[PDB]
Short mmCIF file of C-alpha atoms in Angstrom, two decimals:
data_model
loop_
_atom_site.label_atom_id
_atom_site.label_comp_id
_atom_site.label_asym_id
_atom_site.label_seq_id
_atom_site.Cartn_x
_atom_site.Cartn_y
_atom_site.Cartn_z
CA UNK G 84 0.00 0.00 0.00
CA UNK G 85 1.12 3.68 -0.26
CA UNK G 86 1.63 3.68 3.51
CA UNK G 87 -1.02 6.27 4.37
CA UNK G 88 -3.78 5.58 1.85
CA UNK G 89 -7.35 4.46 2.41
CA UNK G 90 -9.37 3.22 -0.56
CA UNK G 91 -12.81 1.64 -0.66
CA UNK G 92 -15.42 0.63 -3.20
CA UNK G 93 -18.87 -0.86 -3.19
CA UNK G 94 -20.71 -3.91 -4.47
CA UNK G 95 -24.47 -4.13 -4.65
CA UNK G 96 -26.16 -7.29 -3.46
CA UNK G 97 -29.15 -8.04 -5.66
CA UNK G 98 -31.11 -10.32 -3.36
CA UNK G 99 -30.34 -9.64 0.29
CA UNK G 100 -31.51 -6.51 2.08
CA UNK G 101 -28.44 -6.55 4.35
CA UNK G 102 -25.26 -4.54 3.80
CA UNK G 103 -21.72 -5.77 4.30
CA UNK G 104 -18.38 -4.16 5.11
CA UNK G 105 -14.85 -5.29 5.85
CA UNK G 106 -11.89 -3.21 6.99
CA UNK G 107 -8.31 -4.42 6.60
CA UNK G 108 -4.90 -3.60 8.03
CA UNK G 109 -1.51 -4.57 6.59
CA UNK G 110 0.65 -4.46 9.69
CA UNK G 111 3.82 -6.30 8.72
CA UNK G 112 5.31 -9.71 8.07
CA UNK G 113 5.10 -12.26 10.85
CA UNK G 114 7.91 -11.14 13.05
CA UNK G 115 7.89 -12.26 16.68
CA UNK G 116 6.85 -8.82 17.83
CA UNK G 117 3.96 -8.48 15.40
CA UNK G 118 2.40 -11.81 16.32
CA UNK G 119 2.05 -10.73 19.90
CA UNK G 120 1.05 -7.23 18.91
CA UNK G 121 -1.81 -8.53 16.84
CA UNK G 122 -2.84 -11.26 19.27
CA UNK G 123 -2.89 -8.89 22.24
CA UNK G 124 -4.68 -6.17 20.30
CA UNK G 125 -7.14 -8.78 19.08
CA UNK G 126 -7.76 -9.95 22.62
CA UNK G 127 -8.33 -6.51 24.01
CA UNK G 128 -10.91 -5.64 21.37
CA UNK G 129 -13.01 -8.74 21.78
CA UNK G 130 -15.00 -8.00 24.86
CA UNK G 131 -15.72 -4.25 24.50
CA UNK G 132 -16.88 -4.86 20.94
CA UNK G 133 -18.95 -7.69 22.36
CA UNK G 134 -20.26 -5.34 25.00
CA UNK G 135 -21.14 -2.28 22.99
CA UNK G 136 -21.52 -2.94 19.28
CA UNK G 137 -23.61 -6.09 18.91
CA UNK G 138 -25.14 -5.96 22.38
CA UNK G 139 -25.62 -2.27 23.05
CA UNK G 140 -25.70 -0.65 19.63
CA UNK G 141 -27.57 -3.72 18.31
CA UNK G 142 -26.02 -3.33 14.87
CA UNK G 143 -26.34 -6.92 13.75
CA UNK G 144 -25.17 -10.45 14.36
CA UNK G 145 -22.21 -10.47 11.98
CA UNK G 146 -19.44 -8.70 13.84
CA UNK G 147 -16.04 -10.30 13.48
CA UNK G 148 -12.41 -9.21 13.69
CA UNK G 149 -9.06 -10.90 13.64
CA UNK G 150 -5.88 -12.08 11.96
CA UNK G 151 -4.86 -12.68 8.39
CA UNK G 152 -1.83 -14.87 7.98
CA UNK G 153 -1.40 -14.86 4.23
CA UNK G 154 1.53 -14.76 1.76
CA UNK G 155 3.91 -14.78 4.73
CA UNK G 156 2.40 -11.45 5.75
CA UNK G 157 0.44 -10.93 8.89
CA UNK G 158 -2.70 -8.83 8.73
CA UNK G 159 -5.69 -7.45 10.57
CA UNK G 160 -9.28 -7.54 9.42
CA UNK G 161 -12.72 -6.64 10.72
CA UNK G 162 -15.82 -8.39 9.45
CA UNK G 163 -19.18 -6.78 10.11
CA UNK G 164 -22.42 -7.32 8.18
CA UNK G 165 -25.49 -5.37 9.29
CA UNK G 166 -28.34 -3.46 7.71
CA UNK G 167 -27.08 0.13 8.09
CA UNK G 168 -25.75 2.99 6.01
CA UNK G 169 -22.11 2.03 5.51
CA UNK G 170 -20.54 5.40 6.29
CA UNK G 171 -22.78 5.66 9.33
CA UNK G 172 -21.52 2.20 10.13
CA UNK G 173 -17.97 3.46 9.60
CA UNK G 174 -18.72 6.25 12.02
CA UNK G 175 -19.61 3.79 14.74
CA UNK G 176 -16.59 1.68 13.85
CA UNK G 177 -14.36 4.71 14.36
CA UNK G 178 -16.34 5.42 17.49
CA UNK G 179 -15.34 1.99 18.74
CA UNK G 180 -11.78 2.83 17.72
CA UNK G 181 -11.85 5.98 19.86
CA UNK G 182 -13.44 3.89 22.60
CA UNK G 183 -10.48 1.57 22.46
CA UNK G 184 -8.22 4.61 22.28
CA UNK G 185 -9.46 5.72 25.66
CA UNK G 186 -9.47 2.09 26.79
CA UNK G 187 -5.73 1.96 26.19
CA UNK G 188 -5.01 4.46 28.93
CA UNK G 189 -7.67 2.87 31.09
CA UNK G 190 -5.73 -0.35 31.39
CA UNK G 191 -4.42 -1.11 34.87
CA UNK G 192 -1.44 -3.31 35.58
CA UNK G 193 -3.78 -6.07 36.73
CA UNK G 194 -5.93 -6.07 33.60
CA UNK G 195 -2.69 -6.14 31.60
CA UNK G 196 -1.32 -9.14 33.51
CA UNK G 197 -4.51 -11.18 33.69
CA UNK G 198 -5.21 -10.33 30.05
CA UNK G 199 -1.86 -11.56 28.80
CA UNK G 200 -2.15 -14.64 31.02
CA UNK G 201 -5.53 -15.31 29.41
CA UNK G 202 -3.95 -14.98 25.97
CA UNK G 203 -1.10 -17.24 27.07
CA UNK G 204 -3.32 -20.10 28.12
CA UNK G 205 -5.48 -19.38 25.06
CA UNK G 206 -2.44 -19.83 22.89
CA UNK G 207 -0.51 -22.41 24.86
CA UNK G 208 -2.20 -25.79 24.89
CA UNK G 209 -1.12 -29.29 24.15
CA UNK G 210 -3.26 -30.69 21.31
CA UNK G 211 -6.26 -32.90 21.87
CA UNK G 212 -6.29 -34.55 18.45
CA UNK G 213 -3.62 -35.73 16.09
CA UNK G 214 -5.55 -34.06 13.26
CA UNK G 215 -5.51 -30.78 15.18
CA UNK G 216 -1.75 -30.41 15.42
CA UNK G 217 -1.41 -31.80 11.90
CA UNK G 218 -3.58 -29.02 10.52
CA UNK G 219 -1.43 -26.46 12.31
CA UNK G 220 1.79 -28.04 11.13
CA UNK G 221 0.38 -28.38 7.63
CA UNK G 222 -0.52 -24.71 7.88
CA UNK G 223 3.17 -24.10 8.40
CA UNK G 224 4.07 -26.38 5.53
CA UNK G 225 1.86 -24.53 3.09
CA UNK G 226 3.54 -21.36 4.28
CA UNK G 227 6.98 -23.05 4.33
CA UNK G 228 7.76 -21.53 7.71
CA UNK G 229 8.74 -24.56 9.84
CA UNK G 230 9.17 -22.46 13.00
CA UNK G 231 8.26 -25.37 15.22
CA UNK G 232 8.80 -23.63 18.56
CA UNK G 233 7.30 -20.26 17.70
CA UNK G 234 4.99 -20.78 20.70
CA UNK G 235 7.62 -20.68 23.46
CA UNK G 236 9.46 -17.99 21.50
CA UNK G 237 6.38 -15.81 21.33
CA UNK G 238 5.69 -16.41 25.03
CA UNK G 239 9.26 -15.33 25.80
CA UNK G 240 8.46 -12.19 23.83
CA UNK G 241 5.03 -11.93 25.48
CA UNK G 242 6.60 -11.52 28.87
CA UNK G 243 8.57 -8.59 27.45
CA UNK G 244 5.75 -6.14 26.68
CA UNK G 245 4.55 -2.86 28.15
CA UNK G 246 1.50 -0.67 27.89
CA UNK G 247 3.63 1.99 26.18
CA UNK G 248 4.76 -0.61 23.66
CA UNK G 249 1.23 -0.85 22.35
CA UNK G 250 0.86 2.91 22.58
CA UNK G 251 3.83 3.21 20.26
CA UNK G 252 2.28 0.44 18.20
CA UNK G 253 -0.94 2.44 18.12
CA UNK G 254 0.27 5.96 17.35
CA UNK G 255 2.22 5.47 14.14
CA UNK G 256 0.63 2.31 12.82
CA UNK G 257 -2.92 2.18 14.14
CA UNK G 258 -3.98 5.71 15.05
CA UNK G 259 -5.83 8.15 12.81
CA UNK G 260 -2.69 10.31 12.69
CA UNK G 261 -0.48 7.69 11.15
CA UNK G 262 2.34 7.82 8.59
CA UNK G 263 2.24 4.01 8.57
CA UNK G 264 -1.51 3.74 8.02
CA UNK G 265 -2.44 0.73 5.85
CA UNK G 266 -6.20 0.90 5.95
CA UNK G 267 -8.65 -0.33 3.36
CA UNK G 268 -12.36 -0.94 3.53
CA UNK G 269 -14.78 -2.75 1.22
CA UNK G 270 -18.51 -2.08 0.90
CA UNK G 271 -21.08 -4.74 0.16
CA UNK G 272 -24.33 -2.90 -0.37
CA UNK G 273 -27.91 -3.79 0.50
CA UNK G 274 -30.48 -4.71 -2.17
CA UNK G 275 -31.56 -1.08 -2.60
CA UNK G 276 -28.31 0.51 -1.42
CA UNK G 277 -19.71 10.55 20.22
CA UNK G 278 -17.37 12.48 17.91
CA UNK G 279 -16.47 11.95 14.26
CA UNK G 280 -13.52 13.69 12.53
CA UNK G 281 -13.09 14.66 8.85
CA UNK G 282 -11.98 11.45 7.14
CA UNK G 283 -10.00 11.79 3.90
CA UNK G 284 -11.74 11.09 0.64
CA UNK G 285 -11.19 7.56 -0.69
CA UNK G 286 -11.51 6.57 -4.33
CA UNK G 287 -13.71 3.95 -5.94
CA UNK G 288 -12.07 0.90 -7.50
CA UNK G 289 -13.44 0.35 -10.99
CA UNK G 290 -10.52 -1.83 -12.13
CA UNK G 291 -8.77 -3.82 -9.45
CA UNK G 292 -5.94 -4.59 -11.84
CA UNK G 293 -5.62 -0.89 -12.61
CA UNK G 294 -5.98 -0.42 -8.87
CA UNK G 295 -3.00 -2.69 -8.28
CA UNK G 296 -1.24 -1.09 -11.25
CA UNK G 297 0.77 1.27 -9.11
CA UNK G 298 0.85 -0.69 -6.01
CA UNK G 299 4.11 -2.37 -5.05
CA UNK G 300 4.48 -5.97 -3.95
CA UNK G 301 5.68 -7.48 -0.74
CA UNK G 302 8.83 -9.56 -0.33
CA UNK G 303 8.52 -13.08 0.87
CA UNK G 304 9.87 -14.66 4.01
CA UNK G 305 13.25 -16.23 4.65
CA UNK G 306 12.04 -19.68 5.79
CA UNK G 307 12.83 -20.89 9.29
CA UNK B 237 16.18 -3.06 -3.71
CA UNK B 238 16.44 -2.13 0.01
CA UNK B 239 17.46 1.44 -0.87
CA UNK B 240 21.00 1.17 0.47
CA UNK B 241 22.40 -2.21 -0.51
CA UNK B 242 25.29 -2.97 -2.83
CA UNK B 243 25.14 -6.61 -3.86
CA UNK B 244 27.43 -8.55 -6.20
CA UNK B 245 28.41 -12.04 -7.39
CA UNK B 246 30.83 -13.67 -9.80
CA UNK B 247 30.83 -15.74 -12.98
CA UNK B 248 33.82 -17.65 -14.35
CA UNK B 249 34.60 -17.47 -18.07
CA UNK B 250 35.76 -20.49 -20.06
CA UNK B 251 36.84 -19.19 -23.46
CA UNK B 252 38.17 -15.65 -23.15
CA UNK B 253 40.87 -14.56 -20.74
CA UNK B 254 39.16 -11.16 -20.43
CA UNK B 255 36.96 -10.34 -17.47
CA UNK B 256 33.63 -8.58 -17.55
CA UNK B 257 31.70 -6.43 -15.11
CA UNK B 258 28.52 -4.40 -15.12
CA UNK B 259 27.22 -1.94 -12.57
CA UNK B 260 23.54 -1.08 -12.38
CA UNK B 261 21.42 1.60 -10.76
CA UNK B 262 17.72 1.49 -10.03
CA UNK B 263 16.99 5.17 -10.28
CA UNK B 264 13.22 5.73 -10.54
CA UNK B 265 10.31 5.53 -12.99
CA UNK B 266 10.40 7.69 -16.10
CA UNK B 267 9.33 10.94 -14.59
CA UNK B 268 10.20 14.15 -16.40
CA UNK B 269 12.71 14.97 -13.69
CA UNK B 270 14.43 11.61 -13.76
CA UNK B 271 14.75 11.54 -17.55
CA UNK B 272 16.70 14.79 -17.42
CA UNK B 273 18.66 13.70 -14.35
CA UNK B 274 19.88 10.48 -15.87
CA UNK B 275 20.39 11.62 -19.46
CA UNK B 276 22.29 14.76 -18.56
CA UNK B 277 24.29 13.01 -15.88
CA UNK B 278 25.15 10.20 -18.26
CA UNK B 279 26.26 12.57 -21.00
CA UNK B 280 28.27 14.74 -18.63
CA UNK B 281 30.09 11.63 -17.42
CA UNK B 282 30.33 10.27 -20.97
CA UNK B 283 32.95 12.43 -22.59
CA UNK B 284 35.37 12.75 -19.62
CA UNK B 285 35.20 8.99 -19.17
CA UNK B 286 36.21 8.65 -22.81
CA UNK B 287 38.89 11.27 -22.36
CA UNK B 288 40.35 9.88 -19.13
CA UNK B 289 39.61 6.17 -18.66
CA UNK B 290 39.89 4.89 -22.21
CA UNK B 291 42.05 7.51 -23.89
CA UNK B 292 44.24 8.75 -21.07
CA UNK B 293 44.22 5.85 -18.60
CA UNK B 294 44.15 3.21 -21.37
CA UNK B 295 42.29 0.65 -19.28
CA UNK B 296 40.82 -1.37 -22.17
CA UNK B 297 38.85 -1.18 -25.39
CA UNK B 298 35.53 -2.53 -24.15
CA UNK B 299 34.34 0.28 -21.89
CA UNK B 300 30.71 1.34 -21.91
CA UNK B 301 28.45 3.51 -19.78
CA UNK B 302 24.87 4.59 -19.97
CA UNK B 303 21.10 4.38 -19.70
CA UNK B 304 18.80 1.39 -19.31
CA UNK B 305 15.08 1.88 -20.00
CA UNK B 306 13.13 -1.17 -18.89
CA UNK B 307 9.72 -1.97 -17.39
CA UNK B 308 8.89 1.71 -17.29
CA UNK B 309 11.90 2.16 -15.00
CA UNK B 310 15.01 4.09 -15.81
CA UNK B 311 18.44 2.66 -15.15
CA UNK B 312 22.12 3.28 -15.45
CA UNK B 313 24.57 0.68 -16.66
CA UNK B 314 28.28 0.38 -17.33
CA UNK B 315 29.87 -2.25 -19.52
CA UNK B 316 33.59 -2.74 -19.20
CA UNK B 317 35.54 -5.75 -20.38
CA UNK B 318 39.24 -5.92 -19.58
CA UNK B 319 41.64 -8.40 -18.04
CA UNK B 320 41.74 -7.12 -14.44
CA UNK B 321 40.91 -7.93 -10.82
CA UNK B 322 37.29 -6.83 -10.50
CA UNK B 323 37.77 -4.95 -7.24
CA UNK B 324 40.83 -3.23 -8.73
CA UNK B 325 38.53 -2.08 -11.53
CA UNK B 326 35.92 -1.04 -8.92
CA UNK B 327 38.57 1.15 -7.37
CA UNK B 328 39.03 2.90 -10.69
CA UNK B 329 35.26 3.16 -11.03
CA UNK B 330 35.15 4.96 -7.70
CA UNK B 331 38.12 7.01 -8.86
CA UNK B 332 36.11 8.16 -11.87
CA UNK B 333 33.28 8.96 -9.46
CA UNK B 334 35.63 11.20 -7.47
CA UNK B 335 36.75 12.64 -10.82
CA UNK B 336 33.13 13.53 -11.43
CA UNK B 337 32.94 14.87 -7.87
CA UNK B 338 35.60 17.38 -8.76
CA UNK B 339 33.95 17.82 -12.15
CA UNK B 340 30.86 19.01 -10.32
CA UNK B 341 32.70 21.98 -9.02
CA UNK B 342 34.65 22.46 -12.21
CA UNK B 343 31.58 23.14 -14.30
CA UNK B 344 31.62 26.59 -15.83
CA UNK B 345 28.61 28.28 -17.33
CA UNK B 346 29.92 27.26 -20.74
CA UNK B 347 30.24 23.53 -19.99
CA UNK B 348 26.69 23.63 -18.62
CA UNK B 349 25.32 25.49 -21.65
CA UNK B 350 27.14 23.60 -24.38
CA UNK B 351 26.28 20.38 -22.59
CA UNK B 352 22.57 21.06 -22.43
CA UNK B 353 22.69 22.20 -26.07
CA UNK B 354 24.42 18.88 -26.81
CA UNK B 355 21.73 16.95 -24.92
CA UNK B 356 19.10 19.07 -26.70
CA UNK B 357 20.18 18.28 -30.24
CA UNK B 358 20.84 14.74 -28.98
CA UNK B 359 17.21 14.43 -28.08
CA UNK B 360 15.61 16.84 -30.55
CA UNK B 361 16.41 15.72 -34.07
CA UNK B 362 13.82 15.23 -36.83
CA UNK B 363 13.54 11.75 -38.38
CA UNK B 364 14.78 10.97 -41.84
CA UNK B 365 12.78 7.76 -42.43
CA UNK B 366 9.43 6.44 -41.37
CA UNK B 367 11.06 3.34 -39.92
CA UNK B 368 13.14 5.48 -37.54
CA UNK B 369 10.25 7.37 -35.99
CA UNK B 370 8.12 4.25 -36.20
CA UNK B 371 10.75 2.39 -34.21
CA UNK B 372 10.70 5.17 -31.63
CA UNK B 373 6.93 5.12 -31.49
CA UNK B 374 6.92 1.34 -31.26
CA UNK B 375 9.41 1.77 -28.43
CA UNK B 376 6.68 3.76 -26.72
CA UNK B 377 4.08 1.15 -27.58
CA UNK B 378 6.02 -1.59 -25.88
CA UNK B 379 5.94 0.57 -22.77
CA UNK B 380 2.29 1.51 -23.53
CA UNK B 381 2.99 5.14 -22.58
CA UNK B 382 1.82 7.24 -25.60
CA UNK B 383 3.34 10.49 -24.29
CA UNK B 384 3.91 11.71 -27.81
CA UNK B 385 5.20 15.17 -26.85
CA UNK B 386 7.47 14.00 -24.05
CA UNK B 387 10.29 15.46 -26.16
CA UNK B 388 9.28 19.12 -26.07
CA UNK B 389 7.91 18.66 -22.54
CA UNK B 390 11.14 17.25 -21.19
CA UNK B 391 13.20 19.81 -23.13
CA UNK B 392 11.02 22.60 -21.69
CA UNK B 393 11.80 20.97 -18.37
CA UNK B 394 15.48 20.82 -19.31
CA UNK B 395 15.86 24.56 -19.06
CA UNK B 396 14.46 24.42 -15.52
CA UNK B 397 17.50 22.44 -14.38
CA UNK B 398 20.45 24.16 -12.73
CA UNK B 399 24.01 23.35 -11.84
CA UNK B 400 22.94 23.27 -8.18
CA UNK B 401 20.27 20.74 -9.08
CA UNK B 402 22.96 18.24 -9.99
CA UNK B 403 24.55 18.69 -6.58
CA UNK B 404 21.12 17.86 -5.24
CA UNK B 405 21.18 14.90 -7.60
CA UNK B 406 24.57 13.75 -6.39
CA UNK B 407 24.32 13.71 -2.63
CA UNK B 408 21.46 11.43 -1.66
CA UNK B 409 21.26 9.47 -4.89
CA UNK B 410 24.81 9.11 -6.16
CA UNK B 411 27.39 9.29 -3.38
CA UNK B 412 28.90 6.31 -1.59
CA UNK B 413 27.17 7.12 1.73
CA UNK B 414 23.93 7.59 -0.23
CA UNK B 415 20.61 6.89 1.54
CA UNK B 416 19.04 6.26 -1.87
CA UNK B 417 21.80 3.85 -2.97
CA UNK B 418 20.48 1.32 -5.50
CA UNK B 419 23.80 -0.13 -6.58
CA UNK B 420 24.63 -3.59 -7.85
CA UNK B 421 27.63 -4.99 -9.65
CA UNK B 422 28.16 -8.31 -11.42
CA UNK B 423 31.48 -10.05 -11.89
CA UNK B 424 32.23 -12.03 -15.02
CA UNK B 425 35.72 -13.26 -14.12
CA UNK B 426 38.44 -14.29 -16.59
CA UNK B 427 38.82 -17.83 -17.97
CA UNK B 428 41.12 -18.71 -15.04
CA UNK B 429 28.98 -6.33 0.82
CA UNK B 430 27.32 -9.69 0.26
CA UNK B 431 27.71 -12.33 -2.39
CA UNK B 432 24.74 -13.43 -4.51
CA UNK B 433 24.62 -17.23 -4.38
CA UNK B 434 20.96 -17.99 -5.08
CA UNK B 435 18.82 -16.05 -7.55
CA UNK B 436 15.87 -17.84 -6.01
CA UNK B 437 16.99 -16.40 -2.68
CA UNK B 438 17.39 -13.15 -4.62
CA UNK B 439 13.76 -13.24 -5.59
CA UNK B 440 12.81 -14.61 -2.15
CA UNK B 441 12.82 -11.31 -0.35
CA UNK B 442 12.53 -8.31 -2.55
CA UNK B 443 9.68 -5.86 -3.18
CA UNK B 444 8.42 -4.84 -6.60
CA UNK B 445 8.17 -1.46 -8.22
CA UNK B 446 4.83 0.18 -8.99
CA UNK B 447 3.97 0.71 -12.60
CA UNK B 448 3.35 3.85 -14.56
CA UNK B 449 -0.01 5.43 -15.13
CA UNK B 450 0.10 5.49 -18.95
CA UNK B 451 -0.38 8.88 -20.52
#
């Protein structure tokens, strides 16, 4: 991406009266820092989104977020399908982003420590099926990574993490004032389709090849 | 390239006792600035290289320098065959670079003006056959650009260049400490940094350029 750009386009669903949207973030490759960045950030946004957006704002039932391990590149995505105006819906997405922005500074030490212990036991587990660990290993094999002990490595990194680390992860990469902003949204229209700033104008994507015409490509990973 | 690296590898000849080498520069896309930058820099290092290196220094007969237009990306290339140690020859390459460094400060108004007039008639010359201009046009068509009046546009730009511009061209882009260093050499040794062992590992971790919006 061009490191600060946000583009979007729309697709009209003929049949269904519901609208879809998905917002995507190209963080980085899978370095040991970025795995724990994205896992921790994913864990901290699960329950307040669960609390306010689907429950309280009653947007819809399709409200998903999470990782994107693809092409040796890590990534962050948000999957929400509800029957709303999409820019309105964007406004409440950004409202949840500001909510998390305040929720950064609202973290105690205890919430931090119990939260990363929760993520640790969420991540660390011996398998319960031979097929389970085989699908994970095979998921390495299709990505040619082979980092067999990434778990203990990532936990050793996980113990070395501060609040200010994710602040510095937020400000340049994730915040609205970001020189490292890799943000892209996609609109899926419907059948007939407390503070918001001035977002920049995106552009529509008539030709995705001509879209990608001036976009560079990522390197691939040195295999472990 | 990762904007600073200078990578190299070697190839061993069988038949000829002469050694080859070629040094390449990823400059930028064909913008109107970069066309002038590279053409005028290449021509201003063309004639003193011929005067010093080949004529005066008498290194060898196969000595070449110059542009490389490919994939909508400009480039700079140097083709020298001689029977030498390749790093020895590199030292004289860097010596010619220092020679140019002094030649920056030795430019008069006259050298500047005769040089850009040289460049001008070098670029701006009417065709004498349909196949000539057709080959030029076809050379656009293979890059799908169609900027038919890039000649007068770039020449109108050419007058906007200064001497001090080429200092600005030298420092970040061309020097040895350069932050914008896109430098790569290739050794083609005689019959008898980091190394480049695997071209697969070459392609394993490098980004790709954007392409040009065609005019």
